[PDB]
Amino acid sequence: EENVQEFVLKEDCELRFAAGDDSDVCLELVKGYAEIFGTELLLNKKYTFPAKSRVAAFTWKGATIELVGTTESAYVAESTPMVIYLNIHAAMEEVRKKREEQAKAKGPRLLLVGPTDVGKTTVSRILCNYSVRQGRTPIFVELDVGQNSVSVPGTVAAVLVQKTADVIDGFERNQPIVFNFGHTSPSANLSLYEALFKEMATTLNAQIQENDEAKIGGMIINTCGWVDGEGYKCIVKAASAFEVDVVIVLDHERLYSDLSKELPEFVRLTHVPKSGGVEQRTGQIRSKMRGENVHRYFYGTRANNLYPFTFDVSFDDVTLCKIGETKLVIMEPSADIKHHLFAFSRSTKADENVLKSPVFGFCLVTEVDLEKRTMSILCPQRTIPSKVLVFSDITHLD
Numbered sequence: 161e162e163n164v165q166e167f168v169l170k171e172d173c174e175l176r177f178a179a180g181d182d183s184d185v186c187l188e189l190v191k192g193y194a195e196i197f198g199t200e201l202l203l204n205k206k207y208t209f210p211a212k213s214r215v216a217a218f219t220w221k222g223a224t225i226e227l228v229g230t231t232e233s234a235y236v237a238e239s240t241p242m243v244i245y246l247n248i249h250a251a252m253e254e255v256r257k258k259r260e261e262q263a264k265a266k267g268p269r270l271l272l273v274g275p276t277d278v279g280k281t282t283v284s285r286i287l288c289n290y291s292v293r294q295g296r297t298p299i300f301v302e303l304d305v306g307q308n309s310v311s312v313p314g315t316v317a318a319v320l321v322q323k324t325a326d327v328i329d330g331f332e333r334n335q336p337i338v339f340n341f342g343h344t345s346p347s348a349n350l351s352l353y354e355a356l357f358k359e360m361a362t363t364l365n366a367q368i369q370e371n372d373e374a375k376i377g378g379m380i381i382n383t384c385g386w387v388d389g390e391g392y393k394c395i396v397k398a399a400s401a402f403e404v405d406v407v408i409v410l411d412h413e414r415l416y417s418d419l420s421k422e423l424p425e426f427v428r429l430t431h432v433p434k435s436g437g438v439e440q441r442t443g444q445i446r447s448k449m450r451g452e453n454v455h456r457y458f459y460g461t462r463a464n465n466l467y468p469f470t471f472d473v474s475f476d477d478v479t480l481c482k483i484g485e486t487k488l489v490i491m492e493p494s495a496d497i498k499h500h501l502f503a504f505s506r507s508t509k510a511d512e513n514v515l516k517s518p519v520f521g522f523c524l525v526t527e528v529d530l531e532k533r534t535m536s537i538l539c540p541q542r543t544i545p546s547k548v549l550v551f552s553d554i555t556h557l558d
């Protein structure tokens with residue numbers, strides 16, 4: 161906190177910095193205009209970033225920015241792909257306007273594809289914020305069951321974006337449509353994964369019939385980093401199910417080349433480079449981040465603390481079940497359900513409906529008392545929203 165760094169940013173430059181392993185870093189815009197991943201920074205506001213945060217503060221006109229704290233790295237980059245990300249947004253709004261003049265209108269749908277650590281989530285965040293700043297309400301679709309920015313790991317989720325992402329905490333998670341996949345990787349159950357995003361695409365298509373702003377708002381869809389083998393036809397089916405107009409490929413020439421020949425001719429295909437500010441995460445970093453995502457789901461953030469309940473549930477009051485390829489199996493309260501997430505299915509009964517039903521939310525089984533026939537759960541709300549609890553293979557040690 162007694163260590164300050166001052167930076168001058170010319171137009172079209174970004175301050176890339178990573179917070180230390182131990183320290184927070186406070187960022188303040190002191191002159192000009194700046195944005196962090198598409199969200200405008202307010203002049204003279206203090207943004208505290210937690211340890212190990214990797215952030216870029218970009219400026220369209222020029223800015224002076226102050227960093228307070230211990231940084232692992234901090235420099236001004238003069239070359240960025242930010243204008244590319246702007247033009248993609250500009251192209252979408254052009255499609256919105258052309259479709260709008262038939263009075264309703266269906267907004268452009270965009271599929272982001274590529275391997276891990278290309279800045280795919282970052283770009284999806286930028287594109288959503290720009291649509292919001294344009295006055296539109298896009299639907300952000302999260303297909304990455306490994307690193308999910310809307311719900312917990314092992315989920316396919318979609319959210320209506322009505323406000324720009326918070327600089328620190330990201331997008332508001334206001335009433336998301338969440339499907340429980342139950343695995344960190346699509347390879348664990350390929351056919352179920354495909355059935356879920358098809359059920360996602362169908363649910364959204366019926367719901368945009370009742371919301372005009374959401375329909376014209378369009379979709380920005382983040383896929384997972386699985387591009388090889390079975391991950392490829394998985395991209396093709398995602399493009400098909402969601403009826404996308406544009407596919408953006410980040411930093412993968414072969415994938416771009418393969419898709420150029422298999423995609424329907426009406427689909428626009430754009431290859432873009434990854435930002436020099438994106439760096440390769442190791443396996444254990446993603447694993448650690450999944451646990452931090454689970455913690456965030458129950459306990460919230462520093463800015464918005466959530467207060468989860470810890471109460472006991474009788475095994476008589478609930479039906480525990482597991483999806484396992486697409487058949488449903490009823491679970492008998494074992495010791496092995498401990499530390500596992502469970503989804504509150506929107507289905508009233510534990511039958512065929514569970515497979516394709518969205519969920520109310522999640523709980524974490526913390527204790528299992530087989531001799532008392534009770535379990536301890538961590539839950540976002542006072543009472544359980546559903547008697548049907550669906551097994552997730554994701555484990556969290558709180």
Ligand SMILES: Nc1ncnc2c1ncn2[C@@H]1O[C@H](COP(=O)(O)OP(=O)(O)O)[C@@H](O)[C@H]1O
Pocket residue numbers: 174176177213214215216275276277278279280281282283435436437438439
């Ligand atoms: N221009 C940039 N400068 C600095 N860090 C960045 C930049 N773009 C992305 N990052 C950071 O790199 C990390 C990985 O980005 P992410 O979008 O999650 O990649 P992917 O979704 O493709 O795995 C994130 O922590 C993000 O904040």
Ligand SMILES: [Mg+2]
Pocket residue numbers: 280281282304307
């Ligand atoms: Mg990602």
